[PDB]
UniProtKB/Swiss-Prot annotation, chain A:
GO cellular component annotations of the record: mitochondrial matrix; mitochondrion
Protein name (database record): D-2-hydroxyglutarate dehydrogenase, mitochondrial
Positions contributing to Zn(2+) binding: 382, 389, 423
Pfam families: FAD-oxidase_C, FAD_binding_4
Catalytic activity: (R)-2-hydroxyglutarate + A = 2-oxoglutarate + AH2; (R)-malate + A = oxaloacetate + AH2
GO biological process: 2-oxoglutarate metabolic process; lactate metabolic process; malate metabolic process; response to cobalt ion; response to manganese ion; response to zinc ion; tartrate metabolic process
Regulation of catalytic or functional activity: Activated by zinc and cobalt ions.
Effect of residue 425 to R: In D2HGA1; uncertain significance; almost complete loss of catalytic activity
The protein's Enzyme Commission number: 1.1.99.39
Phenotype when changing residue 75 to K: In D2HGA1; uncertain significance; complete loss of catalytic activity
Consequence recorded when altering residue 389 to A: Loss of catalytic activity
Subcellular location: Mitochondrion
Function per UniProt: Catalyzes the oxidation of D-2-hydroxyglutarate (D-2-HG) to alpha-ketoglutarate. Also catalyzes the oxidation of other D-2-hydroxyacids, such as D-malate (D-MAL) and D-lactate (D-LAC). Exhibits high activities towards D-2-HG and D-MAL but a very weak activity towards D-LAC.
Amino acid sequence: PVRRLPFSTVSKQDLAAFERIVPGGVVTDPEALQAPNVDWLRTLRGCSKVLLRPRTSEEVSHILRHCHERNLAVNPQGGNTGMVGGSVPVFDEIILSTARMNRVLSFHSVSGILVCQAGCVLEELSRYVEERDFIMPLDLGAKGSCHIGGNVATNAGGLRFLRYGSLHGTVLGLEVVLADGTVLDCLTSLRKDNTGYDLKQLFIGSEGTLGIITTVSILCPPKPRAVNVAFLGCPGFAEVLQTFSTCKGMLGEILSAFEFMDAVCMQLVGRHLHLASPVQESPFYVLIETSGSNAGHDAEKLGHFLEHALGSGLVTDGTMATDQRKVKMLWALRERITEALSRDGYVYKYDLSLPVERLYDIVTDLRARLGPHAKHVVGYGHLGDGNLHLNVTAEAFSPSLLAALEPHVYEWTAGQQGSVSAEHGVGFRKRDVLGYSKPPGALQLMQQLKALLDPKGILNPYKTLPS
Amino acid sequence: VRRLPFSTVSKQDLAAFERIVPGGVVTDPEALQAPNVDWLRTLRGCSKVLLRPRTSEEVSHILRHCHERNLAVNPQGGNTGMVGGSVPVFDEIILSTARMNRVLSFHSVSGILVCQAGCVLEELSRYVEERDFIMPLDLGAKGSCHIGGNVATNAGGLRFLRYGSLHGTVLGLEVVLADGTVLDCLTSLRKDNTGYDLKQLFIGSEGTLGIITTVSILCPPKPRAVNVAFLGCPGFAEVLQTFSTCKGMLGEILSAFEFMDAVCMQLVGRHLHLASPVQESPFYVLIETSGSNAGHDAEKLGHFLEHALGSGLVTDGTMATDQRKVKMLWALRERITEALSRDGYVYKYDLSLPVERLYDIVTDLRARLGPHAKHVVGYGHLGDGNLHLNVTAEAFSPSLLAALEPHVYEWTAGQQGSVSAEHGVGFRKRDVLGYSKPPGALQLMQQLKALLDPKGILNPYKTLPS
Ligand SMILES: Cc1cc2nc3c(=O)[nH]c(=O)nc-3n(C[C@H](O)[C@H](O)[C@H](O)COP(=O)(O)OP(=O)(O)OC[C@H]3O[C@@H](n4cnc5c(N)ncnc54)[C@H](O)[C@@H]3O)c2cc1C
Ligand SMILES: Cc1cc2nc3c(=O)[nH]c(=O)nc-3n(C[C@H](O)[C@H](O)[C@H](O)COP(=O)(O)OP(=O)(O)OC[C@H]3O[C@@H](n4cnc5c(N)ncnc54)[C@H](O)[C@@H]3O)c2cc1C
Ligand SMILES: O=C(O)CCC(=O)C(=O)O
Ligand SMILES: O=C(O)CCC(=O)C(=O)O
Ligand SMILES: [Zn+2]
Ligand SMILES: [Zn+2]
C-alpha cells in the first residue's frame, strides 16, 4: 500500500491555535469526524482527527500559515461528492471544509457576473441567480451538495456543458489561498482581461493540490425564455448516433443538452427509485433539452426534428414536455442513475472520453468478458461531449473482477487515444493511471508546478499526480 | 530600456542554425527590415538574424542551441500585435512561424482542427468553411495573423460574444520550451481532466513561456444563416438599450454586437474611402446573428428591428444576408484600427469597463483635451465590455502623453477595469499592470517565468514588470 509521508501530527497546541483562528469552527469529536472521513462511494475512509470550518478567506490564510510552519497536511473538502477519492484523507490530514464559506458577495444584474464564496452550494446558487433570471453555466446531479469551489477545483463538466462549455471559460476570477497562507487575488470579475498570465487557470482542475479556492467570480448565462425536453427510445446505438447528428442539424443553436442511457440504466432507476418509463421499452434512451429565446420557434424546430427522427426510424417512441414539473420528471431519469447504481451494489466506475462513434463498444465488450460475475454493466452519459460513464455493479467487490477490468479498460481507452478521466478528475483513485492519457514530460511539468506552489506538499498529499 | 547580458550571434552560431534549418536562415539586412518593425511602426529592432523553421523538431533544436549559448529569441507570428511584443528591442533572434503553415488533421464530424502555429487565420477559415465549419474566433487582422499568435496573445475578437475564449475553444497545444524540451499537450478531446490543464499557461503567455508550434482547436459548425444589421443610434443611452433589447429578443442567435462613434465613421470614410450605408448618427451598432434556421432568424430580426425603430432607439438601419453586403458592412467596423493609424499618431488604450459607463471616458477625454488632440474616438466589443479608446494627433506630443497617462489607467483602475482587455501586455504595457493586477499575482507570474525559462531567453523585456 501507500506509505504515510513524514508530516507532523496535530497537538493540543495546534487545536488551541485553530480555536483562536476560527472560534467555534473546530470539530474534534471522533463520531462527528466519521462522516467527513468517508468518501461519497463509501469505499475510502480517512483517519483525520480534526475538521476546521472557517467562515472567511483570512481564516483560511491563517490556518494554512500555521499548517505550513508546523508541517501539517491539509485535505480540502467541499460538498464531498467527488468520485475519485480526492475529497477525504488517506491518513490523518486535517479536513478543511468550506461548508461555512457560503456567502454571495455580489451579483450584477446586467453583466450576469456572480461573485461568491467557494462553499456556496450549486443548487442554492442556481436558486439565487434564477430568481434574477440568470442560470449557472453548469449543472450536475450533485447540485444539491457540491460546492462551487469543488466544481472549480475538479473542473466539473455536467449536463449543460454542451451549451455553455468549460469552467476554464466561464470562471472569470478566483481568490486562492496558497499552501504557505499567501492570498492570491486573481478575482477579476471582468469578461476580458489580458493583463499577464491567466494564473487562475492553474487552479481549475487542480483538485486542491496547488491552493484552496476561497472566492469565485463566474459568468452566469441568462435564463432561457423557453425550455423543452424530449425523451426518446432508440432501437440501437447507431440510431442514437444518427439521432444526435439529426438533432444538431435541425435544432442547432437552441440545443442545451444531449444525454443517453441504456436499457439497464432505465431498469435500475425504475427498480430502486420507482420511476416508471414514459416511453416504450427500448435498448437505448436519449434525453434532449433545448433552451431558447422564442418558444414558438423552438417548438417548430423540435416538431420538425421529431417528425423526421420518427420518420426515418431513428426513434421508435418519444415524449415531449414544457411543463416545469414534467421536465423535471424526465430529467430525474437521467440525473439519478448514479444513485441507483450505488444502491445496486458495489460499483466499479469509469469516466471516459472516447470517439463518439465508438462510445458504447466497451460496454458490449465488458458484458461479454465479464460473465455472471458482474451483477450489471451499464453505459450512459454526455454523448454530445464524447463522455461515457461506464459502471459495473456486483454484490461485493472482488479482486478477480478488478483484474478483468484493469488495466483492460485503460488499455482500450489508450488504444482509442481517449481520456481515462473525462470530468471526475484524478484524486486518490486514478493518480497512477495518468500515463494512458498524458505523456511523461507533461506529468513532469505538473510535478514542477506542485513543487513551486507547495514545496512542503501539505495540500492533499497522495493525490492527484503520479507517485 | 537597457540590454540584458545575452551572448551575441557569431559566425559559428549562423553555421549551426544553417545545419538545423537549411534554407531558413535569413541575414540580408534589407530583408530583416520589415520583421524588425512592429505593426504600428513605433518600435524598430536591430535583429540581424531571422530563422524560419518548418517543423517542431527544428524549433526544438534551435531553442536547445539558444539555451546552451544564452541567445535571446523573439518568437514572431503575423506581426500584427499591437503592444510591441512581436519585434525585438535589441538583438534577439527572430524565430518566425511563417513556414509552419500545414494543416495536420481535421475531423469532419467533431469539428476538431489540428494545425501548425503559423497557419494564417483567414486561410484556416477558408479551409474549415469549405468543410462547413468556422473558426471560433475572428479579428480584423485575419489576413495576416497566425493561429499561434492568436493563442499566444489570447486574442478575443469579433465572435467572442458567441464562441467565447480560446481558453475554452483550444483543446490542445504542442509547445517548445526555452531549453528545447517539447511539451506535448496536443490532445484532441473535448473533455480531459487527467491532471493540470497545462496548456492554459501558454494561452496569453505571449511567447515568454514557450513557443507554440501546434494547435488543436474546436471549430463551431458553419451557420446556415448569418445576418448583419448596421444601425445608427442617436446617443450612447440608446446604444445600451439597443444592446439590452437585442439580447432579450435575439438571444442565442446573437454572434456579434459592435459599436463605433461618429468620428470613427468619418475616419474610415476619409482615409479608407468607405461610404456609410445609413444616415449620419452620433453612434453606430453592428449586430450579427448566426443560426440554423434562416426563417426563424429572419423573423427574430424583423421583430427586433420593428421594435427598435418603433421605440426610437435606432434612427436609420440597413440589414444584409447576402455574403457580399455582409462583408461590406463588416468592413466599416473591421478597418477602424487602420483608418485610425492613417489619421496621424495614435495613443491606443484597450480597456474592459462596466458596459453602462463604457463611453464616459471618451467624453471625459474630449473635455479634458480641448483642441490639443486631433480626434478622440471610442469603438469596439460593447457586448464584452471592451472599449478601444484612441486619441489621434497630427504628431506625438509629450504634453498630450502627460495628459493621457497615468490618467486613463487611473480611471480604469477606479472602475476595477482592465488596462489591456485584448491586445495584451508586450513591451508597451509591462509597467502598467499594477492598475489591474495586485503584486502577489505579478510575483507568481515572475516565478512561473523563472521556472519555465530561467535564462530568460524567450521574449526579454516583455511581458512582466521590469
Ligand atoms: C450524483 C452525482 C453526480 C455527479 N455528476 C457529475 C457530473 O455530471 N459532472 C462532473 O464533472 N462531476 C460530477 N460528479 C462528481 C463531481 O466531481 C462532484 O459532484 C463535484 O465536482 C465536486 O464538488 P464537491 O464540493 O463535492 O467537492 P469535494 O468532493 O468536496 O472535493 C473535490 C476535490 O476538490 C478538492 N477541493 C474541494 N473544495 C476545494 C476548494 N475550495 N479549493 C480547492 N480544492 C478543493 C478536494 O480536495 C477534492 O480533491 C457527480 C457526483 C455525484 C455524487
Ligand atoms: C486590423 C487589426 C485588428 C485586430 N483586431 C483584434 C481584435 O479584434 N482582437 C484582438 O484580441 N486582437 C486584435 N488585433 C491584434 C491581435 O493581438 C493580433 O492581431 C493577433 O493576436 C495575432 O497576432 P500575430 O499572429 O500577428 O502574432 P505576432 O504579432 O507576430 O506576435 C504577438 C505576440 O505573441 C508572440 N507570439 C507570436 N507567435 C507566437 C508563437 N507561435 N508562440 C509563442 N509566442 C508567439 C510574439 O512574441 C508577440 O509577443 C488586431 C490587429 C490588427 C492589425
Ligand atoms: O455515475 C457516475 O459514474 C458519475 C456521475 C455523473 O458524472 C453523471 O451522472 O453525469
Ligand atoms: O484599434 C484598436 O485599438 C485595435 C483593434 C481591434 O481589436 C478591433 O478592431 O476590434
Ligand atoms: Zn457526468
Ligand atoms: Zn478588438
